[PDB]
Amino acid sequence: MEFAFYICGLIAILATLRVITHTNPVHALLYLIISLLAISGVFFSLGAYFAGALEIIVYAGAIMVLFVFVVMMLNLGGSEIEQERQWLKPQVWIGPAILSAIMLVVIVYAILGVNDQGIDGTPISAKAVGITLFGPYVLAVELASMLLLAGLVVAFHVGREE
């Protein structure tokens, strides 16, 4: 239950590292789906079963389908960027990578030194998440519906063809 967590975390890290340093959009989305599967494996290794279930049902099964759908619709076949590839020349990526490494080392220094009994991995089932969702989190559910309705309206208003 720990070996699965470490191997899935390593797979997720390597997959998003390949995502941010790739040029083909479909390959980037495929490696992104691979990392989402890995992070769902991370969730299942921790006992958050419902989180992994919604990770593959929705994140790697609805949102990334929309990203792939848009990629095929706009038909990116080397529109002046696949022939340039600025993110491989060092003057574009060394600076932001240095800044990100500094932020990572600051956050990691914050993480260490914090008391840790370990993660038990006890399965928090979907019925407990459902009880909490419609119990002490009622307005969160109703206004998450309101938020998704707002997103529906704005995405229709922008993206319609006419």
Partner 1 sequence: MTITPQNLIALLPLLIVGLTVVVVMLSIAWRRNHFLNATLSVIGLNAALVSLWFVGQAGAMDVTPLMRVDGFAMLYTGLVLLASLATCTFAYPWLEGYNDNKDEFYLLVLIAALGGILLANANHLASLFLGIELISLPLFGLVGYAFRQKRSLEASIKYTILSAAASSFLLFGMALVYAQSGDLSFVALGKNLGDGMLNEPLLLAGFGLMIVGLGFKLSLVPFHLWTPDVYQGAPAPVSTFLATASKIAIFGVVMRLFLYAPVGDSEAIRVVLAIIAFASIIFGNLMALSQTNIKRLLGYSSISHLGYLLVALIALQTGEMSMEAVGVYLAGYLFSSLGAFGVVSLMSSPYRGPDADSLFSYRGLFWHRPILAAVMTVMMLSLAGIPMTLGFIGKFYVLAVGVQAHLWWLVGAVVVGSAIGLYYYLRVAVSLYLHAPEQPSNWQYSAGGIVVLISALLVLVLGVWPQPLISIVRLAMPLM
Partner 2 sequence: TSTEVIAHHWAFAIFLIVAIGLCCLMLVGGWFLGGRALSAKFYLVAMFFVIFDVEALYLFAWSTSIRESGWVGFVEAAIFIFVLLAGLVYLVRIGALDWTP
Partner 3 sequence: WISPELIEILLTILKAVVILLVVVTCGAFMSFGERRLLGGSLQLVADMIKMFFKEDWIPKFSDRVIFTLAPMIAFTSLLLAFAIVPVSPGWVVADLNIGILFFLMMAGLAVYAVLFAGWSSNNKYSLLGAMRASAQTLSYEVFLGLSLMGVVAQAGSFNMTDIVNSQAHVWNVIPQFFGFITFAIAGVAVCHRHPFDQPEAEQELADGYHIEYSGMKFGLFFVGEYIGIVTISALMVTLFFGGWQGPLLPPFIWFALKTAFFMMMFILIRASLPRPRYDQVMSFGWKICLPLTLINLLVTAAVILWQAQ
Ligand X SMILES: CCCCCCCCCCCCCCCCCCCC
Ligand Y SMILES: CCCCCCCCCCCCCCCCCC(=O)OC[C@H](COP(=O)(O)OCCN)OC(=O)CCCCCCCCCCCCCCCCC
User: Which residue has its beta carbon closest to ligand Y?
Assistant: 41
CB 42 to partner 2: min, Å: 17
Scan residues 139-158 and list those touching ligand X (CB under 6 A): 139, 142
Burial 1-23 (b: 16+ CB within 10 A, else e): eeeebeebeebbeebbebbeebe
Query: What's the maximum distance between 2 C-alpha atoms anywhere in the chain?
Result: 58
Partner that binds at residue 127, options ligand Y, partner 2, ligand X, none, CB closer than 5 to 8 Å by kind = partner 2
CB 145 to partner 1: min, Å: 10
Burial 113-133 (b: 16+ CB within 10 A, else e): eeeeeeeeeeebeeeebeeee
Scan residues 37-56 and list those touching partner 2 (CB under 8 A): 50, 54
Partner that binds at residue 152, options partner 1, partner 2, ligand Y, none, CB closer than 5 to 8 Å by kind = partner 2
57 binds partner 2 (CB under 8 A): yes
Are 32 and 15 in contact by the 8 Å Cβ rule? The answer is yes
The residues of the shown chain that bind ligand X, judged by CB under 6 A, are 138-139, 142
